[PDB]
Design an enzyme around this catalytic site. Structure first.
Site, PDB file in Angstrom:
ATOM      1  N   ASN A 267       0.659  -1.200  -0.160  1.00  0.00           N
ATOM      2  CA  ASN A 267      -0.062   0.022   0.060  1.00  0.00           C
ATOM      3  C   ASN A 267       0.761   1.276  -0.110  1.00  0.00           C
TER       4      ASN A 267
ATOM      5  N   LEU B  36       2.026   3.327  -2.206  1.00  0.00           N
ATOM      6  CA  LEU B  36       2.918   3.577  -3.497  1.00  0.00           C
ATOM      7  C   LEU B  36       2.616   4.747  -3.771  1.00  0.00           C
TER       8      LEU B  36
ATOM      9  N   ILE C  53       4.747   8.396  -5.631  1.00  0.00           N
ATOM     10  CA  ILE C  53       5.509   9.280  -6.247  1.00  0.00           C
ATOM     11  C   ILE C  53       5.255  10.649  -6.433  1.00  0.00           C
TER      12      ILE C  53
ATOM     13  N   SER D 269       6.245   9.581 -14.301  1.00  0.00           N
ATOM     14  CA  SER D 269       6.640   9.036 -15.678  1.00  0.00           C
ATOM     15  C   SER D 269       8.262   9.185 -16.054  1.00  0.00           C
ATOM     16  N   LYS D 270       8.641   8.601 -14.946  1.00  0.00           N
ATOM     17  CA  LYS D 270       9.983   8.239 -15.027  1.00  0.00           C
ATOM     18  C   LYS D 270      10.509   6.668 -14.677  1.00  0.00           C
ATOM     19  N   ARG D 271       9.632   6.023 -14.665  1.00  0.00           N
ATOM     20  CA  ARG D 271       9.723   4.464 -14.653  1.00  0.00           C
ATOM     21  C   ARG D 271      10.240   4.138 -12.977  1.00  0.00           C
ATOM     22  N   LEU D 272      10.102   5.137 -12.240  1.00  0.00           N
ATOM     23  CA  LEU D 272      10.418   4.923 -10.817  1.00  0.00           C
ATOM     24  C   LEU D 272       9.760   3.736 -10.110  1.00  0.00           C
ATOM     25  N   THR D 273       8.490   3.579 -10.589  1.00  0.00           N
ATOM     26  CA  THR D 273       7.465   2.485 -10.091  1.00  0.00           C
ATOM     27  C   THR D 273       8.164   1.109  -9.818  1.00  0.00           C
TER      28      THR D 273
ATOM     29  N   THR E 291      -4.277  -3.755  -3.694  1.00  0.00           N
ATOM     30  CA  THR E 291      -5.380  -3.399  -4.295  1.00  0.00           C
ATOM     31  C   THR E 291      -4.832  -2.212  -5.182  1.00  0.00           C
TER      32      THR E 291
ATOM     33  N   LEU F  46      -6.911  -0.953   3.043  1.00  0.00           N
ATOM     34  CA  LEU F  46      -7.040   0.430   3.564  1.00  0.00           C
ATOM     35  C   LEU F  46      -6.916   1.497   2.347  1.00  0.00           C
TER      36      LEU F  46
HETATM   37  C1  LIG Z   1       6.839 -10.805  -2.213  1.00  0.00           C
HETATM   38  C2  LIG Z   1       6.780  -9.277  -1.979  1.00  0.00           C
HETATM   39  C3  LIG Z   1       6.219  -8.532  -3.180  1.00  0.00           C
HETATM   40  C4  LIG Z   1       5.685  -6.807  -3.029  1.00  0.00           C
HETATM   41  C5  LIG Z   1       5.388  -6.273  -4.214  1.00  0.00           C
HETATM   42  C6  LIG Z   1       4.055  -6.890  -4.913  1.00  0.00           C
HETATM   43  C7  LIG Z   1       3.713  -5.851  -5.941  1.00  0.00           C
HETATM   44  C8  LIG Z   1       3.264  -4.646  -5.429  1.00  0.00           C
HETATM   45  C9  LIG Z   1       2.583  -3.688  -6.623  1.00  0.00           C
HETATM   46  C10 LIG Z   1       2.405  -2.233  -6.141  1.00  0.00           C
HETATM   47  C11 LIG Z   1       1.025  -2.405  -5.346  1.00  0.00           C
HETATM   48  C12 LIG Z   1       0.774  -0.823  -5.203  1.00  0.00           C
HETATM   49  C13 LIG Z   1      -0.853  -0.628  -4.475  1.00  0.00           C
HETATM   50  C14 LIG Z   1      -1.137   0.898  -4.166  1.00  0.00           C
HETATM   51  O1  LIG Z   1      -0.393   1.501  -3.483  1.00  0.00           O
HETATM   52  S1  LIG Z   1      -2.220   1.516  -5.347  1.00  0.00           S
HETATM   53  C15 LIG Z   1      -2.210   3.390  -4.907  1.00  0.00           C
HETATM   54  C16 LIG Z   1      -1.040   3.632  -6.198  1.00  0.00           C
HETATM   55  N1  LIG Z   1      -0.723   5.236  -5.882  1.00  0.00           N
HETATM   56  C17 LIG Z   1      -1.492   6.398  -6.503  1.00  0.00           C
HETATM   57  O2  LIG Z   1      -2.238   6.093  -7.359  1.00  0.00           O
HETATM   58  C18 LIG Z   1      -0.982   7.569  -5.949  1.00  0.00           C
HETATM   59  C19 LIG Z   1      -0.917   8.693  -7.059  1.00  0.00           C
HETATM   60  N2  LIG Z   1      -0.047   8.306  -8.202  1.00  0.00           N
HETATM   61  C20 LIG Z   1       1.252   7.948  -8.075  1.00  0.00           C
HETATM   62  O3  LIG Z   1       1.763   8.170  -7.163  1.00  0.00           O
HETATM   63  C21 LIG Z   1       1.868   7.633  -9.337  1.00  0.00           C
HETATM   64  O4  LIG Z   1       1.165   7.770 -10.425  1.00  0.00           O
HETATM   65  C22 LIG Z   1       2.230   5.989  -9.172  1.00  0.00           C
HETATM   66  C23 LIG Z   1       3.226   5.813  -7.984  1.00  0.00           C
HETATM   67  C24 LIG Z   1       1.031   5.166  -8.730  1.00  0.00           C
HETATM   68  C25 LIG Z   1       2.792   5.652 -10.514  1.00  0.00           C
HETATM   69  O5  LIG Z   1       4.070   6.268 -11.035  1.00  0.00           O
HETATM   70  P1  LIG Z   1       3.933   7.018 -12.354  1.00  0.00           P
HETATM   71  O6  LIG Z   1       3.005   7.232 -12.964  1.00  0.00           O
HETATM   72  O7  LIG Z   1       5.130   7.760 -12.516  1.00  0.00           O
HETATM   73  O8  LIG Z   1       4.634   5.831 -13.239  1.00  0.00           O
HETATM   74  P2  LIG Z   1       6.205   5.078 -13.499  1.00  0.00           P
HETATM   75  O9  LIG Z   1       6.638   5.933 -14.898  1.00  0.00           O
HETATM   76  O10 LIG Z   1       7.306   5.238 -12.311  1.00  0.00           O
HETATM   77  O11 LIG Z   1       5.833   3.628 -13.830  1.00  0.00           O
HETATM   78  C26 LIG Z   1       4.989   3.170 -15.017  1.00  0.00           C
HETATM   79  C27 LIG Z   1       4.620   1.687 -14.475  1.00  0.00           C
HETATM   80  O12 LIG Z   1       4.077   1.583 -13.215  1.00  0.00           O
HETATM   81  C28 LIG Z   1       2.562   0.842 -13.334  1.00  0.00           C
HETATM   82  N3  LIG Z   1       1.904   1.251 -12.431  1.00  0.00           N
HETATM   83  C29 LIG Z   1       1.077   2.591 -12.539  1.00  0.00           C
HETATM   84  N4  LIG Z   1       0.223   2.627 -11.302  1.00  0.00           N
HETATM   85  C30 LIG Z   1       0.400   1.344 -10.730  1.00  0.00           C
HETATM   86  C31 LIG Z   1      -0.093   0.889  -9.401  1.00  0.00           C
HETATM   87  N5  LIG Z   1      -1.072   1.649  -8.737  1.00  0.00           N
HETATM   88  N6  LIG Z   1       0.153  -0.114  -8.970  1.00  0.00           N
HETATM   89  C32 LIG Z   1       1.335  -0.931  -9.483  1.00  0.00           C
HETATM   90  N7  LIG Z   1       1.803  -0.414 -10.647  1.00  0.00           N
HETATM   91  C33 LIG Z   1       1.465   0.441 -11.261  1.00  0.00           C
HETATM   92  C34 LIG Z   1       2.289   1.409 -14.894  1.00  0.00           C
HETATM   93  O13 LIG Z   1       1.253   0.302 -15.244  1.00  0.00           O
HETATM   94  C35 LIG Z   1       3.816   1.184 -15.617  1.00  0.00           C
HETATM   95  O14 LIG Z   1       4.127  -0.171 -15.858  1.00  0.00           O
HETATM   96  P3  LIG Z   1       4.557  -0.891 -17.001  1.00  0.00           P
HETATM   97  O15 LIG Z   1       4.173   0.142 -18.381  1.00  0.00           O
HETATM   98  O16 LIG Z   1       6.135  -1.179 -16.913  1.00  0.00           O
HETATM   99  O17 LIG Z   1       3.847  -2.497 -17.411  1.00  0.00           O
HETATM  100  C1  LIG Z   2      -9.950  10.697  -3.788  1.00  0.00           C
HETATM  101  C2  LIG Z   2     -10.956   9.967  -4.667  1.00  0.00           C
HETATM  102  C3  LIG Z   2     -10.480   9.364  -5.727  1.00  0.00           C
HETATM  103  C4  LIG Z   2     -11.354   8.645  -6.473  1.00  0.00           C
HETATM  104  C5  LIG Z   2     -12.499   8.601  -6.200  1.00  0.00           C
HETATM  105  C6  LIG Z   2     -13.590   7.929  -7.170  1.00  0.00           C
HETATM  106  O1  LIG Z   2     -13.934   6.600  -6.816  1.00  0.00           O
HETATM  107  C7  LIG Z   2     -12.845   5.806  -6.503  1.00  0.00           C
HETATM  108  C8  LIG Z   2     -12.028   5.559  -7.690  1.00  0.00           C
HETATM  109 CL1  LIG Z   2     -12.418   5.849  -9.305  1.00  0.00          CL
HETATM  110  C9  LIG Z   2     -10.674   4.987  -7.483  1.00  0.00           C
HETATM  111  C10 LIG Z   2     -10.314   4.864  -6.055  1.00  0.00           C
HETATM  112  C11 LIG Z   2      -9.050   4.109  -6.049  1.00  0.00           C
HETATM  113  C12 LIG Z   2      -8.019   4.370  -6.958  1.00  0.00           C
HETATM  114  C13 LIG Z   2      -6.978   3.910  -6.640  1.00  0.00           C
HETATM  115  N1  LIG Z   2      -6.459   3.266  -5.790  1.00  0.00           N
HETATM  116  C14 LIG Z   2      -7.520   3.217  -4.755  1.00  0.00           C
HETATM  117  N2  LIG Z   2      -6.779   2.434  -3.617  1.00  0.00           N
HETATM  118  C15 LIG Z   2      -7.787   2.103  -2.303  1.00  0.00           C
HETATM  119  C16 LIG Z   2      -7.167   1.126  -1.677  1.00  0.00           C
HETATM  120  N3  LIG Z   2      -5.798   0.614  -1.345  1.00  0.00           N
HETATM  121  C17 LIG Z   2      -5.083   1.130  -2.684  1.00  0.00           C
HETATM  122  C18 LIG Z   2      -5.502   2.342  -3.515  1.00  0.00           C
HETATM  123  C19 LIG Z   2      -8.659   3.608  -4.942  1.00  0.00           C
HETATM  124  C20 LIG Z   2     -11.450   5.127  -5.245  1.00  0.00           C
HETATM  125  C21 LIG Z   2     -12.587   5.841  -5.099  1.00  0.00           C
HETATM  126 CL2  LIG Z   2     -13.320   5.973  -3.948  1.00  0.00          CL
HETATM  127  C22 LIG Z   2     -13.287   9.464  -5.126  1.00  0.00           C
HETATM  128  C23 LIG Z   2     -14.600   9.625  -4.848  1.00  0.00           C
HETATM  129  N4  LIG Z   2     -12.251  10.045  -4.507  1.00  0.00           N
END
Ligand SMILES: CCCCCCCCCCCCCC(=O)SCCNC(=O)CCNC(=O)[C@H](O)C(C)(C)COP(=O)(O)OP(=O)(O)OC[C@H]1O[C@@H](n2cnc3c(N)ncnc32)[C@H](O)[C@@H]1OP(=O)(O)O
Ligand SMILES: Cc1ccc(COc2c(Cl)cc(-c3ccnc(N4CCNCC4)c3)cc2Cl)c(C)n1
Length: 392
Positions: free
Chosen positions: A113, A115, A117, A123-127, A149, A392
């Site tokens: 959970n 994650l 940037i 968009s620098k492939r840090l993920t 999730t 969560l």
């Molecule tokens: C045994 C233990 C194993 C433990 C690890 C198990 C795996 C856990 C996996 C993680 C579980 C996380 C659970 C949560 O916390 S889900 C919550 C994710 N966080 C957010 O949405 C916060 C707002 N967004 C950001 O901070 C950024 O946009 C993030 C960091 C999400 C992407 O940063 P950015 O936009 O700068 O991208 P990039 O240029 O670095 O990288 C591009 C690549 O990243 C892939 N990408 C994009 N979004 C996600 C995502 N939500 N899960 C997995 N991968 C994702 C994408 O398809 C592309 O892949 P590919 O083109 O290479 O195929």
């Molecule tokens: C701050 C915010 C984001 C998005 C939305 C719209 O409905 C959702 C939509 Cl489209 C997406 C998500 C959502 C998106 C990405 N990640 C998550 N999670 C929640 C669970 N742990 C991992 C990250 C939820 C959560 C909600 Cl509640 C709403 C109503 N509010």
């Protein structure tokens, strides 16, 4: 199902991969208030937003403390990236341990959970670099599978569940742009539609107490066993995830209520919900939404396998949850289509959300699991019994 590959403990690297120039790895110590503050500062401005850039999740410091230092937690799994020059925290990825049941195979996993940037480093492939590193740190501690999730579609989701939203303070939700005024209607009429009773109805309902832990533990585990994918709760996890600690938690995050049967005084039901605010990004009238999310619950009625009786009992229990959440000054009550929630969501006036939450397993293969919805993405009582874990 089963693991996809076996990890060779002898070959796990003792050193992390390189990072973008000017950045470095940092283990966070969330017992240090300054570092908890740093993570909060990152998430508050850079974490998940809706597609219209109106809202951003605003996990509280108290929430982060609770979510990340749960039983068995390790600081090694609280991973940051800092700017070498300024020392500023610019990225995170976190895990905590738990056990899950996947079609009655018990697995030790990490829940991944937070994650995140910084917008300026997107968009620098840090993920994939963040992911590979937390993977490494988990492998070094003997954990080889994960559950997570995300709102984005990635390879092989195990399930998908739709978000539902029950207005508690409709006017506030209308003012922040979340809830529409449906066209022929009026503010008064929408307020009436969402009106709740002043008192709860379930006999014996009361706040959960520490004395309830063992009986809630037993009941929850029996109820969760009804789902193909579920969290295999320990006693410590019941304590941590369900029992608010007022003497050491100044901002309450978890609410839990039990039903103490008036005749037997045994706990026959329980439900819980957690506090997760959203920042209202630009609005002169409001700057946050105080949302309650439905968490875990259980009821003995489930085990009679009488669907109509289970629906009836949940209708009463969950309307009480709405009433309690309103009294605690929440604006909205959110649920997913998991558990038996399709039995009550629509009739209790939860509105269908735009959001879907996808569930994933790392290094574990199993058949897809029903997520509470049919092919039209609507709640369906024939598509339950699948997702029994709430993340969560
Ligand atoms: C045994 C233990 C194993 C433990 C690890 C198990 C795996 C856990 C996996 C993680 C579980 C996380 C659970 C949560 O916390 S889900 C919550 C994710 N966080 C957010 O949405 C916060 C707002 N967004 C950001 O901070 C950024 O946009 C993030 C960091 C999400 C992407 O940063 P950015 O936009 O700068 O991208 P990039 O240029 O670095 O990288 C591009 C690549 O990243 C892939 N990408 C994009 N979004 C996600 C995502 N939500 N899960 C997995 N991968 C994702 C994408 O398809 C592309 O892949 P590919 O083109 O290479 O195929
Ligand atoms: C701050 C915010 C984001 C998005 C939305 C719209 O409905 C959702 C939509 Cl489209 C997406 C998500 C959502 C998106 C990405 N990640 C998550 N999670 C929640 C669970 N742990 C991992 C990250 C939820 C959560 C909600 Cl509640 C709403 C109503 N509010």
């Amino acid at each position: 199902g089963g693991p996809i590959k076996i990890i060779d403990p002898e070959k796990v690297s003792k050193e992390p991969d390189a990072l973008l120039e000017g950045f470095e790895w940092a283990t966070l110590d969330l017992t240090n208030e300054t570092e908890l503050q740093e993570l909060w500062d990152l998430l508050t401005y850079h974490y998940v937003e809706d597609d219209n850039a109106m809202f951003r999740f605003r996990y509280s410091q108290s929430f982060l403390h609770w979510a990340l230092m749960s039983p068995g937690w390790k600081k090694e799994w609280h991973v940051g990236v800092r700017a070498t020059k300024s020392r500023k925290l610019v990225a995170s990825i976190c895990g905590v341990p738990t056990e899950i049941n996947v079609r009655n195979q018990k697995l030790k996993v990490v829940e991944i959970n937070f994650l995140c940037i910084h917008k300026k480093l997107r968009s620098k492939r840090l993920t994939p670099v963040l992911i590979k590193e937390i993977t490494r740190r988990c492998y070094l501690n003997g954990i080889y599978q994960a559950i997570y999730t995300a709102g984005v579609v990635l390879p092989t989701p195990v399930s998908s569940c739709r978000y539902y939203h029950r207005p508690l303070d409709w006017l506030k939700l209308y003012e922040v742009g979340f809830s529409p005024l449906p066209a022929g209607s009026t503010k008064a009429r929408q307020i009436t539609k969402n009106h709740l009773p002043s008192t709860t109805s379930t006999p014996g309902l009361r706040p959960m107490e520490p004395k309830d832990i063992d009986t809630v533990h037993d009941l929850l585990q029996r109820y969760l066993s009804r789902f193909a994918l579920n969290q295999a709760f320990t006693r410590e996890e019941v304590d941590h995830w369900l029992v608010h600690k007022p003497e050491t938690v100044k901002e309450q995050v978890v609410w839990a209520y039990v039903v103490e049967d008036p005749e037997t005084h045994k706990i026959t039901d329980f439900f819980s919900f957690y506090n997760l605010e959203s920042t209202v990004i630009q609005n002169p009238k409001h700057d946050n939404v105080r949302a309650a999310y439905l968490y875990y619950y259980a009821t003995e009625t489930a085990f009679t396998n009488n669907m109509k009786a289970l629906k009836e009992r949940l209708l009463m229990l969950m309307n009480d949850a709405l009433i309690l959440a309103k009294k605690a000054h929440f604006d909205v009550f959110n649920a997913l289509t998991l558990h038996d929630n399709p039995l009550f969501l629509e009739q209790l006036k939860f509105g269908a959300g735009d959001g879907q939450l996808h569930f994933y397993l790392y290094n574990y293969r199993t058949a897809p699991v029903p997520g509470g919805v049919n092919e039209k993405n609507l709640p369906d009582e024939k598509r339950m019994g699948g997702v029994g874990i709430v993340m969560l």
